[PDB]
Amino acid sequence: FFTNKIGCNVSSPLKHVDIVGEIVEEAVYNFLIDAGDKMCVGNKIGVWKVSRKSLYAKVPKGIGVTVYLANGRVQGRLIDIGVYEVLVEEVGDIIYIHKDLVYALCWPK
Amino acid sequence: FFTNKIGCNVSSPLKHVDIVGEIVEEAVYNFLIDAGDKMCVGNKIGVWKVSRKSLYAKVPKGIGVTVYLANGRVQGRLIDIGVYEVLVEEVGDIIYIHKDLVYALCWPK
Amino acid sequence: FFTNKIGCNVSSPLKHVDIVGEIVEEAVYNFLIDAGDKMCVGNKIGVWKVSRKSLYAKVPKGIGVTVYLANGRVQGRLIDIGVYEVLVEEVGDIIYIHKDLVYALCWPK
């Protein structure tokens, strides 16, 4: 579906997921959204409105990120993105989130 | 589990998912529910009460459908069902939902 | 990620998932948590705070379990754990939950 949607506007219709931007690049598992003051990696496992394996290498390590889930969000310092998981520091603790639950991961430009 | 449950009554115990019907057919990834005034394709990735690869070919294109998610629902005109995704028109916009998040997709008979 | 976290404290940061314990064993798809008065199998598909294929063989059949989902919980008598699914009796009815939606499954010691 996303293959030929580069340049399309895209938004999350989930009320708690404040993402409205443009699709800039697309990868097998996820796609990159330019949201103006922030970028996001949007998961193909997701609910998206529209109007090379992964792009997570784009997310800056050490930066404060917002990981959106289907039912909430995790905000903290990005530690690492592994093969299956995103690790974010909240307080002095590591929050692990499996990638299949990461609906979107945004960071400021 | 669903292999030998044809003829069983089945319901969604999620409060916002108003599905109560009978299992009529079963496929590798999903099963078909006759709910009287509506049919549904129920995802094997789901929470179900009970008391050939896919059945999504049964859903009429162009019809108004209700896509139930774990935490809400998407209602609009069915555009297409692809290999990985369901596309529904809400307003004049395409809502994409990955199949793994489609808990059930119902349409009126 | 979990490979070398045996002995780490682990908790669910989801408000409705009251799990705080220690990682005792780890398997390809899930890991075992000792929570003092209860044990849990935690899914690697999950959100976890930290500070051989599966361990579901540890859960006693017939026991009252609590199956935590991303947005709620199912409590009843464990019937079976199959390859893809957990079956729990609530009332005199079978509740099926696909394993990918089982965030954690706890039982009392």
From TrEMBL, chains A, B, C:
Name this protein carries in UniProt: Uncharacterized protein
Pfam family, one: DUF5607
Residue intervals of the DUF5608 domain: 54-109
Organism: Pyrobaculum spherical virus (isolate United States/Yellowstone)
Residue pairs linked by disulfide bridges in the UniProt entry: 40-106
Domain DUF5607, first and last residues per copy: 1-53
InterPro entries: DUF5607, DUF5608
Signal peptide: none
Source superkingdom: Viruses
